[PDB]
């Protein structure tokens, strides 16, 4: 089997991407944030504290003839950005882009943190990291991809995120029309539960490529590109007037600037992030100071190849017995 679904930016800055997901019978379609950095499929629901729902579409398990409460199971997750959610668990039928999994754990939120409430466009998350990170207790549950894997034509999914435009998540096949040149594959460590890999270096603008190993994660659920302070400093030094602002929480730059591109290495291959992808707009409405899309990972504890990087590529998440990651230009 295969599936193919369009993923759409939630706003004009590409802060996150939503993908429609059918849950239950009859289908209840929710728009979920596909997150290769976590492993829980959780939804706003009829059980979510009412004051914590503000415009989201909810899953109502009582209206699904295939929903079953997973007795005794609870979940609770805290994300890198400080947000969180928790609740109980159903199993139900879940379909993405025509690919159906029966018996998928659907984690129903009883509580969500303010950042989720305030984002009316995201109805929940669909985790695509390794199932070892799943938070369900006392019996850990499998991700949608893990459940689907054996039925797929090939045990892969691909992320093709757009810049200010829709893109695609495919399951079970590689669309050879969706990229240019070749896909370069690189080793993955699953030791921390992530799609963790080592970039071979970087360049800023038209500058020379610096060969240096950068270990990090491919994370569709993180907006920005978080890299070591040395790398980030080298990038922003090429932007007149750019500075790190403790009050704002990262590098800012004059909105009148033209940003240089940023290149990252995948083996001997190179992915070029255009400068415009690195512009996250005014820090506050009407400001002429703009927020940078490349930020330091110092004190995150890990480098993160978030949407800023991934949307410059066609990315293969290869879930073979030994997982790997593939990147192509597009």
From Swiss-Prot:
First-tier enzyme category under EC: hydrolase
Domain Peptidase A1: 17-328
GO molecular function, one term: aspartic-type endopeptidase activity
GO biological process per UniProt: proteolysis
Swiss-Prot/TrEMBL catalytic activity: Hydrolysis of proteins with specificity similar to that of pepsin A, prefers hydrophobic residues at P1 and P1', but does not cleave 14-Ala-|-Leu-15 in the B chain of insulin or Z-Glu-Tyr. Clots milk
Residues annotated as catalytic: 35, 199
Transmembrane segments: none
Record keywords: Aspartyl protease, Disulfide bond, Hydrolase, Protease, Signal, Zymogen
EC number(s) given by UniProt: 3.4.23.22
Entry superkingdom: Eukaryota
Disulfide bonds: 255-290
Similarity section: Belongs to the peptidase A1 family.
Protein name: Endothiapepsin
Origin organism lineage: Eukaryota, Fungi, Dikarya, Ascomycota, Pezizomycotina
């Amino acid at each position: 089997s295969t599936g193919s679904a369009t993923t759409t930016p939630i706003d004009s800055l590409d802060d996150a991407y939503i993908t429609p997901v059918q849950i239950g019978t009859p289908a209840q379609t929710l728009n979920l944030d596909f997150d290769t950095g976590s492993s829980d499929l959780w939804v706003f629901s009829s059980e979510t504290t009412a004051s914590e729902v503000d415009g989201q579409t909810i899953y109502t398990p009582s209206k699904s003839t295939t929903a079953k409460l997973l007795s005794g199971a609870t979940w609770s997750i805290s994300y890198g950005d400080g947000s969180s959610s928790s609740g109980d668990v159903y199993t139900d039928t879940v379909s993405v882009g025509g690919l159906t999994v029966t018996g998928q754990a659907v984690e129903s939120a009883k509580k969500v943190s303010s950042s989720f409430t305030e984002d009316s466009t995201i109805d929940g998350l669909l985790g695509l990291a390794f199932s070892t990170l799943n938070t369900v207790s006392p019996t850990q549950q499998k991700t949608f991809f893990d459940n689907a894997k054996a039925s797929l034509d090939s045990p892969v999914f691909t992320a093709d995120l757009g810049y200010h435009a829709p893109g695609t998540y495919n399951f079970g096949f590689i669309d050879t029309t969706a990229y240019t040149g070749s896909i370069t594959y690189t080793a993955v460590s699953t030791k921390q539960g992530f799609w963790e890999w080592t970039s071979t270096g970087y360049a800023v603008g038209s500058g020379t490529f610096k060969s240096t190993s950068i270990d990090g994660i491919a994370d569709t659920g993180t907006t920005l590109l978080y890299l070591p302070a040395t790398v980030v400093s080298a990038y922003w030094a090429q932007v007149s007037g750019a500075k790190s602002s403790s009050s704002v929480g990262g590098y800012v730059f004059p909105c009148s600037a033209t940003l240089p591109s940023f290149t990252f290495g995948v083996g001997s291959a190179r992915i070029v992030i255009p400068g415009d992808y690195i512009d996250f707009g005014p820090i506050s409405t009407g400001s002429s100071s703009c927020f940078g899309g490349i930020q330091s990972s110092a004190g995150i504890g890990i480098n993160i190849f978030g949407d800023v990087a991934l949307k410059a590529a066609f990315v293969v998440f290869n879930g073979a017995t030994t997982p790997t990651l593939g990147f192509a230009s597009k």
